Structure 1
């Protein structure tokens, strides 16, 4: 069981990604009860980062399953695969 944590804004919002049992899930704080978010992808290891633009939060989550890392992107309109490729 392994986590990654990000936050933004002054509320703040927090996201905690947990890799366990080959899956990565997402717990979210937006100022009230913690909740389970829409992020759900395969992986045994996770990292994440985020930034703000004028009218969106952008999240990049790096999900590693074995020898391959997949980037997952939030830009306000659902989770989409990113263009990241490894070395």
Structure 2
């Protein structure tokens, strides 16, 4: 079991990603309760980074499964698969 954490704004919002048994899930905080995010993909290791473009949040999640890393992107309209490739 392995986690990644990011945050933004002043509230703040927090996202914590968890790799456990080859699935990555997301728990979210935006100032009230912790809830379950829409992020649900394969991998046994995860890292993440985020940035604001004005008020809009952008997140990149790096999900590693079987020796390969997939980038997942949030840009205000669901999780999309990104262009990242490895060595």
Which TM-score band (shorter chain)? over 0.9
Does residue 50 (structure 1) correspond to residue 50 (structure 2)? The answer is yes
Q: Which moved more, 1:49-58 or 1:69-78?
A: 49-58
Gaps of 5+ in 1: none
TM-score w.r.t. the length of structure 1 is: 0.98
* 1:63, distance to aligned residue in structure 2 (A): 0.1
Give the total of aligned pairs: 87
* 1:55, distance to aligned residue in structure 2 (A): 3.9
Gaps of 5+ in 2: none
Which string of whole-angstrom CA distances, capped at 9 and with x for unpartnered residues, describes residues 20-39 of structure 1?
Answer: 01100000000001000000
SS in 2 for 1:86: coil
Distance across 2 between alignment mates of 1:12 and 1:50 = 13
Distance across 1 between alignment mates of 2:41 and 2:25 = 7
Which string of whole-angstrom CA distances, capped at 9 and with x for unpartnered residues, describes residues 22-60 of structure 1?
Answer: 100000000001000000000000000000002410000
Distance across 1 between alignment mates of 2:47 and 2:19 = 10
Moved over 4 A (4+): none
